[PDB]
Structure 1
């Protein structure tokens, strides 16, 4: 099977309505103030839950 008609710009972009990524789930590190992924060690300062890793 092959496309019977080409896909218009309108239709392609309607389809791509939901094709996107989201901002990461990130919060400011309580230790160093830099952003980090929640539930991950902070790479800037190496801290997690107030302790060094």
Structure 2
């Protein structure tokens, strides 16, 4: 159908509160200087001791 009225700003904010994106994970990567997401690529682009891919 079609609308009847406009929704307030706070109603919209509440609506978009749960319209957010999902969360992620944290994991210390052995072959890198920083952490990463569990079973993903790190800031150094390696899951761990095994390198997975190139950079350029």
Tell me, yes or no, whether TM beats 0.5. Answer: yes
Which category describes the TM-score, using the shorter chain as reference length? 0.5 to 0.7
TM-score w.r.t. structure 2 length?
0.58
TM-score w.r.t. structure 1 length?
0.59
Moved over 6 A (4+): none
1-structure distance, mates of 2:47, 2:11: 48
Q: How many residues align?
A: 52
Greater strand fraction, Structure 1 or Structure 2: 1
Q: Which consecutive unaligned segments of at least 5 residues does structure 2 have?
A: none
2-structure distance, mates of 1:11, 1:47: 42
Summarize the Cα distance change of 1:8–1:47 in structure 2 as closer, same or farther, 3 Å threshold. Answer: closer
Q: Which consecutive unaligned segments of at least 5 residues does structure 1 have?
A: none
